[PDB]
Write an enzyme that holds these catalytic residues in place. Structure first.
Site, PDB file in Angstrom:
ATOM      1  CE  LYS A 111      -5.662   1.954  -1.826  1.00 47.72           C
ATOM      2  NZ  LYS A 111      -6.329   2.048  -0.552  1.00 47.72           N
ATOM      3  CE1 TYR A 171      -3.006   3.118   0.261  1.00 46.66           C
ATOM      4  CE2 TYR A 171      -3.532   2.509   2.524  1.00 46.66           C
ATOM      5  CZ  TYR A 171      -3.709   3.347   1.433  1.00 46.66           C
ATOM      6  OH  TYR A 171      -4.586   4.409   1.519  1.00 46.66           O
TER       7      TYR A 171
END
Lengths: 294, 292
Positions: free
Chosen positions: B164, B136
């Site tokens: 992500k 992330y």
């Protein structure tokens, strides 16, 4: 909207200028670079006079001589935009007036790094009203700044002769917002390595220095992405960005000049006491040419 | 991991006045995402769920409810990252036992960890859980800017399966896509879904898909299937909605629109400001114009 200057769409090379050893304009080499862009890169237009390292504190007499030669050599074969900013307002007007008399039908300008938005607006509107010509603004009106706000775009785009913007920082949310809010204005992408994502947001073209040597691939990306061939455009953007990655790590402008010379164009070396290219950067430029452009 | 492609809602969580979880409303939000937004997956425990404002036990309860309600109807990713690596491993083991088949973890933040420490953090969570991991990356909130060679170091781990991607750097996005064709890339910026899709991302994870997931799937599918003109029109309409959401308060406005759609989306965690009369009426107008 139908009022857009849509004929201006396409790929514009930020025209490279070659210099003699003594610093003067290599007029013959410059004509070769213009011809290479028009005949071999097949560019849609030339963007003349953008401020770089060697361009910045060159004399206005030499700026004028570049403008005269470029429009003499290009004639009416491609669209032309003349950057006349990055200097004081009265200086930019006399340069805007000069290139207008030479026959340039579109100006562009970035303001000097002195600031307030009223001063930016007055800068643009003065050039327009004193030259009578059309104007492309920069999304960042000077270097050490950021992109303008959406309502600031509206203030400038209120002027009918301010017909578009060169987008130089890759904020793709702002780029979408500007495209939606001003469908009658031109938007040109300034970031060669992000041409494909800009194209699908509806930009009208692109202005860039790598199109002096990679204009064929750039035109392919632009056209394929607009004609339902996204997978093919992405592969070409991947290949293009392998080349650009190497150009950037090797020194952008010195590498473009080395590859131009490897293509037989008398491009010389970077001007001024600007740093000399190294033996290693010379060899890397040769490898980039063999792998991507030979 | 091709089966993980598609549009993921970053699941919002309804909280009571005292900050405790509203379990009834959380199931309602999950049901709305799966049944009405038709999302391909849920991203549980992300920034959008107010994860970093709540306690470890509260995080665990959210994870329990989400997989109990969602079952195996959609993909599930559990975000377990934290400044506290011991917490990240504890949460990662716990959700792995619950049946989550993929983890995510924000880059450790606040302290200025160097890259070798960030790598140890990711490898440790993977090693200690045996589960798959999605990096992330959110530099706007963490200040952690990851280089292309640094992504390469992380991606040498076969269980670190994707990223992500929330940085608005579309040159880096294209370079990561080219360098790692075997990994998943999820767009994290809902207002830039179309340009990300044509650079080959495998999906998207976003807060606005809780209420605008229909359009988001359209943009994604149309852009992959030679309908760019139509996809741009829908991105334009979406960004009119997102522009209003952002000006009105992101988390408050998504929750308010969910309530206008009959979903009990509760309150935000303090000190998030309570919604104002002006913001309530603005949200009602966004709903009437874009979603009703």
């Amino acid at each position: 909207l139908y009022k857009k200057a849509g004929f201006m769409k396409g790929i514009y090379s930020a025209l490279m200028v070659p210099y003699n050893e003594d610093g003067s304009i290599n007029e013959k080499g410059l004509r070769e670079i213009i011809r290479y862009n028009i005949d071999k890169m097949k560019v849609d237009g030339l963007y003349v006079g953008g401020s770089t390292g060697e361009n910045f504190m060159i004399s206005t007499e030499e700026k004028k001589r570049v403008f005269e030669i470029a429009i003499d050599e290009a004639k009416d074969s491609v669209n032309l935009i003349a950057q006349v900013g990055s200097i004081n307002l009265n200086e930019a007007v006399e340069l805007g007036k000069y290139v207008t008399k030479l026959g340039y039908k579109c100006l562009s300008a970035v303001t000097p790094f002195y600031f307030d938005f009223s001063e930016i607006k007055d800068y643009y509107e003065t050039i327009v009203r004193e030259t009578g010509n059309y104007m492309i603004i920069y999304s960042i009106p000077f270097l050490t700044g950021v992109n303008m706000s959406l309502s600031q775009f509206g203030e400038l785009f209120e002027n009918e002769k301010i017909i578009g913007v060169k987008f130089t920082a890759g904020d793709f949310y702002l780029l979408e917002r500007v495209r939606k809010a001003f469908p009658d204005k031109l938007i040109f992408a300034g970031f060669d390595e992000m041409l494909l994502p800009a194209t699908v947001l509806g930009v009208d073209g692109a202005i860039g220095s790598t199109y002096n040597i990679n204009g064929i691939r750039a035109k392919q990306i632009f056209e394929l992405a607009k004609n339902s061939k996204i997978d093919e455009a992405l592969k070409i953007q991947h290949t293009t960005n392998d080349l650009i990655e190497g150009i950037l790590s090797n020194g952008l402008y010195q590498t473009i000049k080395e590859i131009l010379k490897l293509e037989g164009v008398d491009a010389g070396y970077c001007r001024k006491p600007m740093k000399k290219i190294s033996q290693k950067q010379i060899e890397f430029a040769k490898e980039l040419h063999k792998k991507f452009l030979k």
